[PDB]
Each structure stands twice: as structure tokens, then as C-alpha cells.
A paper describes a structure:
However, Vps75 is best known for its ability to stimulate the histone H3 acetyl transferase activity of Regulator of Ty1 Transposition 109 (Rtt109) in Saccharomyces cerevisiae. All crystal structures published to date show Nap1 (5,6) and Vps75 (7–9) to be homo-dimeric proteins adopting characteristic ‘headphone’ folds, in which a long N-terminal helix self-associates in an antiparallel manner to form the dimerization interface which is capped at either end by a globular domain. In addition to the headphone fold, both Nap1 and Vps75 contain C-terminal acidic domains dispensable for histone binding.
While attempting to crystallize Vps75 in complex with histones H3–H4, we inadvertently crystallized Vps75 with four Vps75 monomers in the asymmetric unit. Upon repetition of the asymmetric unit, two distinct tetrameric assemblies of Vps75 are clearly observed in the crystal lattice. One tetramer is made up of two dimers of Vps75, each composed of a copy of chains A and B, which together form an asymmetric ring-like tetramer. The second, symmetrical ring-like tetramer, is composed of a dimer of chain C and a dimer of chain D. Both tetramers are related structures, with the latter most closely resembling the conformation previously observed in solution. In the symmetrical tetramer, the antiparallel dimerization helices of one dimer form a saltire-like cross with those of the opposing dimer (top middle). In the symmetrical tetramer the ring-like cavity is open at both sides (top left).
Author numbering:
A (entry chain D), B (entry chain D), C (entry chain C), D (entry chain C): 10 to 225
């Protein structure tokens, strides 16, 4: 009845995995209402996101300094976890919504939402990896020369170069999917994790740290 | 009403911290019953712990190979989380219970339990650190020469050396407290964490890995 | 006897330290002529440095992406080791010389050299740490608002902020000394090491890697 | 022109590689005589190696604490670099010689030397990796049950287990070659590097540190 034991143990492991999911759902449910309250207070501080995003340590490593002109117009960010809507979603799946104030003559005021979900390929310990769907955004006027929608050739030496430059901008990240390795915005996956795991949850601590450095 | 906002945010952080604790209690409560069931099956495999303990990668780094003779007689381990009994305990606080089969003429069959709880010293980010109380154990006959209870001098060059050698054995770990840095069993705290965070929860995975290496 | 031995060993360590210096001098002397030859070939490839600097992995982490506009105009870099000129210099001491092509009406074409030398503070094991002297540079026109030489106040909340922003640019690095911890360009020392230990010696390997990726 | 330049740079890299070898030979030649002098003084301190080997931080991670009984009898270690004898040897190639005092009726007093040399497999960047030849050693009497030369079966479940246990002892390391990955003493290569790069060169610093702790 070592047999019975082994069979029993295998089933217990499965129950452990089920428990971890139940625990995570509990956490996400309880946190949802507090995030909504927090977000409401955030809306009362006009320059909040601009400050936080410029303060983060590694965020800046992902995007050309050129983009910051536009990143500075972000005045709202909201993350929502998809597993709260349906149990068919992995606990790590989420949507992220940005609002931009825009810039006269260059960049339209607009709201955009992107969705990220996990998938597995089997083969290798792989807990599974993030994927996303491209989502439309109206690019800044000045980015017309590296806009993939305006470049006619993108197959010529010059066109190919312009194309790759655009895909390396923040706007190229919006059409990231994780399904064409080496052909999309680099590390779109790690950027997404930065948001769900660091930036959205601890933004206030980042803001405080930034306002602290104003004094010394 | 940035003021109101800031005050509101500070309170929300506090609620976050409360939620994390509530989440942890939920996890520990749900897991308790599964651990009891698992443990029951473990009891049916006589050499389980001996195998697991010899299999772990880093456990061996903590104790003289000499001790393994006695570690091999362990036939039962149980961890219990104190926060389940009272909310005055930190979520990380726990008791650990060992049973030894013993060895004829050298080591008595016996059961011992040690308790670990967190404390903070303030000063430094310190999430707080583990502490424990010494607990009595009957040492193996052959360890008489480095037994702190039998060494008369322990202040002479020879006595001091014998004393330090005994405190570096597994049995010296049992009187570890974490309150006399540099004078007790080295890294008693990290060893304790090995048990609560790795060895007890994932013992089955370690056992399987060990039985897997039997084949190649 | 044991005495004699210990004195002998102490002297041998001293001889080891002397040998390490002798070995380093040999390396630097033999390398000097090859660097000069190599540099001559480098001068024939106009966009060399621009490409290499944009290619390095961690260089970008040190400076605002804004600065790259100007970093891209660097068309010459030369490192020389001061220990070759005098034995009073530590083997690690060096001068670094930059030439910038400039940008009409924003940034003047110019050549600048900075010197770095080791010093010790004693106590802490410290092999000793880098120091430098501030060296004058004509800042880009567009950097006028965060130029420490043009800010009148720099003590008001706005002036202090503008001042700190300028000191965090590449140009602020040029007045780094390592003598006012926390008040100068962050990690000026690690940046200097990047140049002497990685960028200058292995630039060609970085360039190749960059040209390798340009098609992919 | 550009052609000429590229050919010139390729040749300069080759010269760099040649220089590194020349520098290394210089270092090894100058150090040889100091090591001989130092070793002579080391021979006058009977318990030197025992203390040093028990003191090293990570050495212990490689071998069963059981082996220390025998490691404690080492009273002499000598490393020599083969590149000093012939230029056909890589700078990293070396021989290592141990002398053991032995233990009456368990372990014979004896001297053993092993040789390590680099080889390349091509493709993977591989600077090339260490290889060695098995060298005969008379095993301790008590290790008879896991001695590969005494196990008759080593193909039965018990024999296979005994065999693998022996190959994981320090004595199994002596027949390591690096030519049968996963079937020989684990990480024999990293252990060899520990000796040539850390233990032999800095033994004195380790000894001092150990004598420093002996009072604390």
C-alpha cells in the first residue's frame, strides 16, 4: 500500500496547485476594491504618472529618450486582472489601459487598452510566457518617417532601417504579441511584467521616493 | 484636497498590508488539512526522511558529515504555523518537531520540538529576523567530548576548542536562539528557513528526484 | 624557526605584489603600440564610435536617452595609461580623450580630455578608488536651462531641481571628481571603468556584433 | 581602403591574442621561483593544509563531509604550470601533486599527481575546457564497499548505487577526465580551477583568516 500512498501523494500535489490558485483569486478579489479607491485619489494629482514614470530606474532602458515627450502626457493608468472575470484565464492575465493628454499639432488625446495572457509551448520547464494582440494607436505626427503604416518599401535598405526604428519605439510595443521572436519590440514581455508586478502596485512608493529626492 | 488624498493614500497602504496578512492566513488554513493528509502517507514510507535529507543540495553544507549517522535515524518531521493558533504571531512563525529512531548504545529514541518566531530591532529595513529558544536533547554518547554540558573548563585552550566544536554540530543548533551573534551554531536562521520554505513543502519533489537518479 | 618562516612568507607576499605590478607594466607597454596602430585604422571608419556606443548593453543605463543626440557626434576616443609615463602613477590610472563633431548652432566641435587616478582612504579593505578633476566643456545650447553655469539660483526649489538635472547628464559627468559622494554625477567611477576595461579594449568586438545584428 | 583597414584590424586582434600569451608566460616564469621559496616555508608548518582546506568557503560543497577525515592528512600540495616546460601547452595547463600522511590500517601514506589540460570541441564559443587522465590511488579501507575496483556487479540495483556513491567521493574525482559528461565525479573541472586559481595562490590569506577566527 506504498502504491496507494504514491497515488494519494500525486493527488495531494494536484490539490496544492488548486489551493495556490484559490489563494491568488482571494488576493485579487480583496485587492480590486482597494485599487479602485486608490486610483480615485491618484486622479486628483495631475502630474502623478509623469513623475512616477520618469522616476523608475529601469523603465527608461526600454525606450528612446525621444518617446518621453509623449510618455509625459500620460495622465491615467489602470490594470485589471482577467482571472476575476473568468476562471478560464490564468491568474497572471491582465489588461492595461492608458490615457494620454496629447500635444497640439503632434499627438491626439486618446485612451488605449492592451491585453496580455499566458500561453505554454510544452518543452522545457516553461511556466508559460506572455502573449498579446496588437492594438491600434494614432502615432505622433513627427514619427511619420518611422511609422510602419506609412513606409512604402520597408524592404529597401532605407525602408528596412526606418521600419526597425519604428518598431523599437513605445508605439511599436503596442503591436507586440510575443509570437514573432526577433521581429517585434524587444522585451515587450518584461516591460509588461514591470507594469503588473512593479509599477502599478508600488507607484506610490516610487512617487514618494521621487518627492523625497526633491529635498536632500 | 491633495491633503485629503495623501492622508487617504497612507491609509490605503495600511489596508494593503492588512490584506496581505489575511491572504496568508487563508493560505495557511487551507493548506493545514492537506499537510495532515500528506504526512499520514509519508509515515508509510520508512526511509523517506533519511533519503530526502541526504538528497538535498545544500543541507549537507551546514553540518559535519559525522552527524549524518544520526540524521539518518530521523523518521518523522512536522511543521506547524503558529499564526493559526493566535493572531499575535507573525505569519512566518512556526514549530518543528523531529522524531529519531535512535541507535543502540549511542543515541536514544526521542522526539524534540523547537520554536521559531520573528522579531525586529528597528534600524534598518529589517523585515525582522528569526529567534528561537534552546531546547533540551540527549546527545549521542560518542559526542561526550564536545558536549557543552560535560566539558568542565571550556575556558582553557582545549576546553574552548572542544566547546566550539560541539556548538557547530546539529545538536548545537538546538540551543541556537539568534540572540548571541558569533557565539552560536552558524546560520541557525537560514537552516530554519530551509525547513519551512523548502524541505517540508517540497520534500516529495526531492524524494522523486532522488529516486529518479537511482535509474539513469 | 617558525618566526623565520613567518617573516619569510610576509616578504614573499610583498614580492608577489611587486611582480603583479611588473607584469602589468609589461602588458601595458606591449599593448600601447598595437592600440596606436588599431586607432589609426579606426579613424578611417567615420561612424564607428556612434555605432559602438549605441550597441553597448549597459552604457545606456548611465545617461538620459536625450544625451545620445550628442554622443552620436563622437568620432574619436583615445585612452592612455599614465603609469607608462611615470612609476608614481598606479597601473590603473588613465586619461581619456574625446572628440565631438558637433551640431551647427547647438554643439561646438571640440576635443576634451579627463584624467582618472586611484586614491585610498584607508581602514576599509579598499584597494583604493578612482578620483578625477573637473574639466571644462561647452554645453549644448539646448541644455542652457540645466546648465550649472547659467542657473542663477540653484537654491530655490526650481533652481535646485534644474541644477540636479544638469549634473545627471553626461556633461555633469565631466565635472565628476569622486570627492563629494551623493552630490555628483551618479557612478562616475563605474562609467570610467566601463571605458578603460570594456569599451576601449573590446570596441571592435562590439562593432562586429552590431553589424551582425543589422541584417539578422 | 576600407578593405585594407579591415584586414589590418583582423591582424591586430591576432597580435593581441599573441600578447596575452606572452604576458601570461612572463607572469608564470617570474612567479615560479617565488612559489618554490614560499612552499619551502609552508613545509615547516605541519597543520597548514589541514587548516586551509577546512577554512575555504566552497571547497566543502564538493565532497562528502566523510572525506574530510582523509583530506585532513594532506601535508603537501604543489601546482606546476605545464606551459613553462613546453609552448605546446596552453597557459592554463597544470599538474597538481598531493601528499597524504595516511591513517594506520585505513589509509596509506602516499603521493599522487594529476594532470589537467585544455581542449576545444569547436562550434560553441568555448575557449576550451579542462580534461584529465585517471590516476591510480589506494583507497581507504573503509571505502571498500563503494570502491569501483571491488564492486563485482555495479549493474545490479545495489551495485549501481554503490558504484555511483564511490564516484562521488574525492577518490572518484581522481579518475575524472571530463570526457564522459554526467558519468563522472560532478564538476571535477570547477574543482581543479579552485586549486589553480584560488587555493594554491591565496592559501596564506585563507590561513591567516582562519587563525584570525580561532580566538574571535
Amino acid at each position: 500500500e506504498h502504491a496507494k500512498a504514491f497515488l494519494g501523494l500525486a493527488k495531494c500535489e494536484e490539490e496544492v496547485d488548486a489551493i495556490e490558485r484559490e489563494v491568488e483569486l482571494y488576493r485579487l478579489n480583496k485587492m480590486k476594491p482597494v485599487y479602485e479607491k486608490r486610483d480615485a485619489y491618484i486622479d486628483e494629482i495631475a502630474e502623478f504618472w509623469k513623475i512616477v514614470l520618469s522616476q523608475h530606474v529601469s523603465f527608461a532602458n526600454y525606450i528612446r529618450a525621444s518617446d518621453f515627450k509623449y510618455i509625459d502626457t500620460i495622465d491615467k493608468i489602470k490594470v485589471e486582472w482577467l482571472a476575476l472575470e473568468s476562471e478560464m484565464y490564468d491568474t497572471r492575465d491582465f489588461s492595461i489601459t492608458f490615457h494620454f493628454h496629447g500635444i497640439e499639432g503632434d499627438f491626439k488625446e486618446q485612451q488605449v487598452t492592451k491585453v496580455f495572457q499566458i500561453k505554454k509551448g510544452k518543452d522545457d520547464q516553461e511556466d508559460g510566457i506572455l502573449t498579446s494582440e496588437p492594438v491600434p494607436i494614432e502615432w505622433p505626427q513627427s514619427y511619420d518617417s518611422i511609422n510602419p503604416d506609412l513606409i512604402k518599401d520597408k524592404r529597401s535598405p532605407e525602408g528596412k532601417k526606418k521600419y526597425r526604428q519604428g518598431m523599437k519605439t513605445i508605439f511599436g510595443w503596442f503591436r507586440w504579441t510575443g509570437l514573432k521572436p526577433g521581429k517585434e519590440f524587444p522585451h515587450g514581455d518584461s516591460l509588461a511584467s514591470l507594469f503588473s508586478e512593479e509599477i502599478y502596485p508600488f507607484c506610490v512608493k516610487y512617487y514618494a521616493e521621487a518627492q523625497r529626492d526633491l529635498e536632500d
